[PDB]
Design a protein around this ligand. Structure first.
Ligand code: GDP
Ligand code: MG
Ligand code: ZN
Lengths: 201, 38
């Protein structure tokens, strides 16, 4: 059992709790940390080289950047930064969240997640995504309520943490059934838009 | 292949039962949440 502490940060209302709750076993075996006001979800993923567990730290409160306690960030080995693609201000604060991560955890693999892409009225489009030089910052579209691209942040983090590029999830975990449809035509267009933008930066 | 004991727990290390952080032998309380190590 290899396991990694993963901190899930971003503005309130971006969908962090909805997102981590999709993993059913991690919800049923979650742990509350009374001293820190935090829920640790033990998320298991089954790779071709064995089980990996991400112990995902989810806040219970709507604290701003630099509002979380020190113990939240302690021993964090990876992170997900989340924003809402229908709220530009949440994306404006992604750099702020990123500073806090470097300040207290130095160099950890980080994934950037634009959530709620199931909504048609998307404000933050792929053309508006500021891509960066560092290879510790990958972007993924996701829709928590539809499980769209749920496994992609974890697969990327697993590959960087384990140091193996060909690491595969042999199966998807048991996820909560979708509460909304991710329109496949939107998905097909967004995937292509993202591919052209990442080729530029 | 497996993970080849890449992330083996050192002899003195202990995993906190409350928050799952891996602590060093010298730590008597967990470094993240301050839960006592048994
Ligand atoms: N359409 C859509 N709504 C979402 C999604 N994820 C979360 N929402 C909603 O966004 C609101 C905040 O969700 P929450 O998980 O509490 O965000 P948090 O503050 O980061 O934990 C809620 O109304 C969610 O139902 C999504 O992926 N798609
Ligand atoms: Mg929440
Ligand atoms: Zn602890």
């Amino acid at each position: 059992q290899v396991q990694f502490k993963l901190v899930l940060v971003g503005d309130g209302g971006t969908g962090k709790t909805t997102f981590v709750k999709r993993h059913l076993t991690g919800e049923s075996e979650k742990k509350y940390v009374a001293t820190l006001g935090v829920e640790v979800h033990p998320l298991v993923f089954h790779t071709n080289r064995g089980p990996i567990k991400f112990n995902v730290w989810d806040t219970a409160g709507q604290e701003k950047f630099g509002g979380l306690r020190d113990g939240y960030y302690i021993q964090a080995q990876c992170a997900i930064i989340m924003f809402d693609v229908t709220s530009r201000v949440t994306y404006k604060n992604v750099p702020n969240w990123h500073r806090d991560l470097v300040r207290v955890c130095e160099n950890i693999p980080i994934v950037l997640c634009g959530n709620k892409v199931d909504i048609k009225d998307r404000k933050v489009k792929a053309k508006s995504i500021v891509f960066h030089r560092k290879k510790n910052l990958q972007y993924y579209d996701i829709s928590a309520k539809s499980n769209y691209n749920f496994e992609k942040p974890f697969l990327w983090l697993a590959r960087k943490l384990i140091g193996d590029p060909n690491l595969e999830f042999v199966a998807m975990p048991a996820l909560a059934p979708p509460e909304v449809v991710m329109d496949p035509a939107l998905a097909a267009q967004y995937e292509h838009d993202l591919e052209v933008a990442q080729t530029t930066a | 292949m497996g993970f080849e004991g890449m992330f083996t727990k050192k002899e003195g290390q202990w995993d906190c039962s409350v928050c799952l952080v891996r602590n060093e032998a010298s730590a008597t309380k967990c470094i993240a949440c301050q839960n006592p190590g048994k």
